Amino acid sequence: SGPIDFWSSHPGQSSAAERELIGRFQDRFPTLSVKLIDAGKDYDEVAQKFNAALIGTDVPDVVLLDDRWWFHFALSGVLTALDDLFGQVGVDTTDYVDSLLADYEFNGRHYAVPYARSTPLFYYNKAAWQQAGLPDRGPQSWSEFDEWGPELQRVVGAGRSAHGWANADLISWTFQGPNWAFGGAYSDKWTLTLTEPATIAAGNFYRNSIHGKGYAAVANDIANEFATGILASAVASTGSLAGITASARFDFGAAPLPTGPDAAPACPTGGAGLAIPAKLSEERKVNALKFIAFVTNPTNTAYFSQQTGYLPVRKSAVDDASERHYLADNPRARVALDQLPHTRTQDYARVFLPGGDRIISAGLESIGLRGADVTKTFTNIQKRLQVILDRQIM
């Protein structure tokens, strides 16, 4: 009871934008109120808190669930299937970007609505690029960047790195694209492929950049380490574009990831959507979908996108006057939009296999941190994952 409880992690440092969308929602429906709740510092903390709440009584009305947690909770049956609610509220689902809404479809039903959606971006420091003699653009291939790497490392010097790789908090997501660009994958649908020769090749490229040629390092806060100049470049979310833009005292570029052979997609989408706990009453499920649909309407997804660097989730958001000027005056904000139709759906091992991402991410960090053998590390992870698969299947 009481207001609509909105549990968010304020992704992209977006709490101010969310308070503002709440204002728009309350002027539009003077009858309903919202309480924005700082439910956690990242998607894992929000999901942890939701888990605890489900065993209890006080469940939120609206909860932010990332590209892994929505499926975990949907498959657990704790989330409202929304397809009939879309019709009852008048949601124009044809207007959401189709790939972004299909990201939440499970067995014919949708269990969340896209909200803070992203692609990774190749951020690069332009002063470093100029010092190294590079052209003003991202690498076209990870092989080309392997040639830039040592040149950048020389100009940035001793307490800096040409490239920062994310730590376990995000490496499974940022390494996904390069893996694809090499023709690898964690898995192909449910079949694991971490020990295919192309996946290992991508692994060794990552390992060699840190321990072989030594122009790359495993970062902590990758966005801030890039913005403060410690990393000459990094793959991080477009969701961090506003924060990086506020802190960086140098000019910088954002580029799409290197594609695969013959421009085959080599970039994931990511981020989170809004969902409604199944154990709410039918009235609160109505108001909750009212809210979710409002703050993700054309004008409002355009606004949230302007404040963060995330993608507008509605096709017609680019019909919005402010969004056209914004994209006009902010080219780095175009990059994720232009990249969106060159993406590839995420490997099942990362997003759907229960516990898969924790295992994959640890393997990748262990490779990065201590230079663990890649073939050995990938074999052990794939065997521990295959154990999961065989168990859940049974």
Ligand SMILES: C[N+](C)(C)CCOP(=O)(O)OC[C@H](O)CO
């Ligand atoms: C909040 N931030 C930007 C610092 C990190 C998460 O970035 P996202 O693009 O929201 O998610 C990426 C991925 O799908 C998560 O599994």
Ligand SMILES: [Mg+2]
């Ligand atoms: Mg409450």
